[PDB]
Design a protein around this motif. Structure first.
Motif, PDB file in Angstrom:
ATOM      1  N   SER C  61       0.928  -1.183   0.024  1.00 10.10           N
ATOM      2  CA  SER C  61       0.006  -0.008  -0.062  1.00 10.10           C
ATOM      3  C   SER C  61       0.977   1.303   0.018  1.00 10.10           C
ATOM      4  O   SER C  61       2.074   1.293   0.663  1.00 10.10           O
ATOM      5  N   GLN C  62       0.380   2.355  -0.355  1.00 10.01           N
ATOM      6  CA  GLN C  62       1.040   3.692  -0.176  1.00 10.01           C
ATOM      7  C   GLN C  62       1.354   3.952   0.978  1.00 10.01           C
ATOM      8  O   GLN C  62       2.377   4.397   1.549  1.00 10.01           O
ATOM      9  N   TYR C  97       3.713   7.395  -9.405  1.00 11.83           N
ATOM     10  CA  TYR C  97       2.782   6.933  -8.486  1.00 11.83           C
ATOM     11  C   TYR C  97       3.105   6.774  -7.135  1.00 11.83           C
ATOM     12  O   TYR C  97       2.570   6.931  -6.143  1.00 11.83           O
ATOM     13  N   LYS C 107      -6.322   8.085   0.019  1.00 12.87           N
ATOM     14  CA  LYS C 107      -5.535   6.860   0.544  1.00 12.87           C
ATOM     15  C   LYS C 107      -4.470   6.312  -0.274  1.00 12.87           C
ATOM     16  O   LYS C 107      -3.353   5.660  -0.019  1.00 12.87           O
ATOM     17  N   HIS C 108      -4.536   6.639  -1.681  1.00  8.46           N
ATOM     18  CA  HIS C 108      -3.472   6.537  -2.583  1.00  8.46           C
ATOM     19  C   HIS C 108      -2.632   7.358  -3.145  1.00  8.46           C
ATOM     20  O   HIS C 108      -1.770   7.330  -3.785  1.00  8.46           O
TER      21      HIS C 108
HETATM   22 CL    CL Z   1      -2.365   2.169  -1.366  1.00  9.87          CL
END
Ligand code: CL
Ligand code: ADP
Ligand code: ADP
Ligand code: ADP
Ligand code: CL
Ligand code: CL
Ligand code: MG
Ligand code: MG
Ligand code: MG
Lengths: 308, 308, 308
Positions: C61-62, C97, C107-108
């Motif tokens: 995940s980020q 990204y 979230k990202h």
């Molecule tokens: Cl994420």
């Protein structure tokens, strides 16, 4: 008259009563050094000196210093006459207290904030005039120029290169940021910012602040189309340790009897020395016996201004 | 078509009816000078001249001038086409009234404020486009460049040095401040500021404003990614007293039949002359007999644009 | 320890299961290329490689990337230690990204916005400290410097000339605008502006963004008087097509075993390489078989950092 020299004595519980004497005229001051103990010295050495200046201030309030040294020069500025107020004297004598003063109670604030306050007050008495105020704040340290209001003020000349320039209107500083101040609160905030910046920059760049010269400039434009600058100057300590003072003292010797470009200080102040300016010198001296030799040196400097 | 030349006649109670004649086509103007009294002159001298331009406007409202000379060029700018509108003519003929207009009543405002108004109006008709507007305001005087929106705009090139530069996108001015204007009020305020500044700078620097060129630039960016500039130009009086006009006239002669860098004006306007620009010339002329010789000179200049 | 090297694998429906193997230690990665079909090649060529780095992140995940690679370096910055986080890898592998992330859901979001968020959060935990935050945003493209937050950011170095300089405090960029951000919203808005500007400038100047390096700098000052910079770097694609990477790779080879000025990238990052900096390298790699050769090249680069 265009040039004034004042003396402000720093208050002390241990005043040198025998050695420092104020004239009745409130313009004179006499210094009586203690005789040397060495037989060869005591009968060949001058121990008594007398000085007559425009005013001698001892145990003087901030309010009284401003009224006496500064008030008129700031008045003449709105009419288009350039004015410079300069504090000179050894480290500890009271230059920064006289020029900045107490940063945390109104009554004890110094010359610089009172000047900003007077400018904007005066603008209210001139309701038919469109009066515009701008400010800059410059530190000179060891022949380098620093902008105390720059966008990254804790890094040097490498990022913010500045060059003193001259034109038909006077001497300015290319690269030195100039800030429009619509109201006194805008000017007060910038004075606060530049002062905070000065402190950070001294720590960040390992400067000894006793060796720096600081010049706060108020640029006035009023329209009869008139412009002026008021330069409020807190000089490096005069104990010469700080070379640039020697060129300033040399300049003043010349004017009384000049390579302005030889020194950043004298170049920046060219218009304050040669001619078209109301110059006020405030000479800060200790009241104590242990500093009497530096005190006399300062008073000899103060005394050069009457001949300019 | 990319180049237009118009004429606007200045209204007068004493119009030169015998000497100035408007064609039926509303595009022609004929000048009939009074015969010289000298015997050697009268039978060797041309007294009659005819001119055909894109439009001749006499006793024309501000609203009508804008619709006629300016409206389309400002429209094409949002689509990515550079546009220049230039006022030319002798001092007193109506250049500043045509370009700026009345600064104190809406109806009589000129081209420049209407252009700013049209840009922001047009942005509303394009709700899916992100359109960003920036402005600059430059005075050219005696081969020196001045920023009318600078931080100290009443002092010269010594403090604010500027240099005309060129890149694949056109000609810009290094050192000339560029201001983002989010809404029409931001752009209007800056136009007001720069105009006030121009006046102060003329007094402060002892400039004769009849000799200066002023260029207000609107930089447009809309995203299809498009950029453009609209240049709104109030030229120096054409009575040549002002040298730089001779290089501009020389340039236009060349384009009809070039050392752009020889003159600040022609360099700044390089992209407005050679090729990729919608150029509109508005030629301001007096309606009175006493100015007929300068009027003819202006009309001969106006007439060079159809060949470009 | 001052230097870290991580790997982030880009998620894929078609992962190269046979050819990419993660160590149990979560720090190792092994690559097993497919044997060449040519008889002369297959028995003379290395097909198996093993790499041990500080961490290998796949399907991460980020939130987890930030906690793992970035969080500590941003923490050390408030204490006065310079920190650089750099994304490296082929075009398409996940550099932008990882560094920027999703610009349209919390979230990202990537490293850069989380860094700005952490700085201002941390300032709240230090209520007796006066902490001041400033930002800059620079693109390096083909040996030219561009200011993504300049006043006309879609025109080049001709208007906004910039020069990398050095002083006792490190390496800065003369001409690169520095913006005070009082609160996280001010810093977020500028990140948005510079990103919008980057896109417009790529279209306007016909830049291929895969070839540009972008460096977002957070300048911290806290007062104990402390200063630091956090440099958040999205490098040009490593597929060398982009020359400047070769000097960066050469530099890192030298440090493991330097003409910093030979290349804008290495000059701008001089203080991030030689010594006084917490350097974090994030190596973005594809998970797919078709990119395995570029993946190995990136992992060989990633592997040079442990020797620095
Ligand atoms: Cl994420
Ligand atoms: N007139 C005065 N009244 C009270 N305190 C003073 C006065 N002049 C100086 N001081 C005090 O003496 C100290 C040194 O003064 P300062 O202005 O900092 O000297 P300088 O700037 O010349 O080095 C400061 O702490 C200041 O409060
Ligand atoms: N079309 C017009 N209608 C009314 N007044 C005009 C017109 N053109 C010019 N004027 C007036 O003539 C004077 C000179 O015009 P101006 O625009 O200042 O000339 P220039 O800029 O060419 O020197 C101004 O006072 C202006 O009000
Ligand atoms: N970890 C990831 N999770 C989901 N999508 C990703 C991830 N990494 C990259 N992408 C996607 O892959 C594409 C390329 O990534 P990008 O960051 O633009 O590559 P680079 O900047 O290295 O050229 C983008 O559309 C992005 O959404
Ligand atoms: Cl007091
Ligand atoms: Cl009208
Ligand atoms: Mg002091
Ligand atoms: Mg005019
Ligand atoms: Mg990318």
């Amino acid at each position: 008259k265009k040039v004034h020299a004042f003396v402000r004595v720093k208050p002390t519980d241990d005043f040198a009563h025998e050695m420092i004497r104020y004239g009745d005229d409130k313009r004179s001051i006499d210094i009586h050094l203690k005789k040397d103990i060495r037989r060869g010295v005591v009968n060949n050495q001058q121990t008594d000196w007398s000085f007559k200046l425009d005013g001698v201030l001892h145990d003087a309030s901030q309010d009284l210093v401003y009224e006496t040294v500064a008030k008129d020069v700031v008045s003449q500025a709105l009419d288009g006459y350039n004015g410079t107020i300069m504090c000179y004297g050894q480290t500890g004598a009271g230059k920064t207290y006289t020029m900045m003063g107490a940063t945390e109670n109104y009554k004890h604030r110094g010359i610089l904030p009172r000047a900003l306050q007077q400018v904007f007050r005066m603008i209210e008495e001139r309701p038919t005039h469109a009066i515009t105020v701008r400010v800059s704040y410059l530190e000179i340290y060891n022949e380098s120029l620093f902008d105390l209001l720059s966008t990254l003020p804790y890094v040097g000349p490498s990022v913010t290169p500045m060059t003193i320039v001259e034109n038909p209107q006077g001497v300015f500083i290319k690269g030195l940021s100039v800030h429009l101040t619509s109201q006194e609160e805008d000017a007060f905030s910038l004075l606060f910012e530049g002062e905070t910046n000065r402190i950070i920059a001294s720590h960040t760049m390992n400067k000894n602040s006793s060796r720096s010269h600081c010049i706060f400039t108020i640029y006035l434009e009023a329209h009869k189309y008139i412009t002026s600058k008021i330069n409020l100057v807190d000089l490096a300590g005069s104990e010469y340790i700080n070379k640039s003072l020697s060129f300033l003292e040399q300049a003043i010797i010349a004017l009384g009897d000049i390579p302005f470009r030889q020194c950043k200080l004298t170049h920046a102040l060219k218009d304050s020395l040669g001619g078209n300016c109301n110059m006020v010198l405030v000479t800060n001296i200790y009241g104590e016996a242990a500093q009497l030799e530096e005190t006399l040196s300062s008073l000899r400097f103060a005394s050069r201004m009457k001949l300019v």
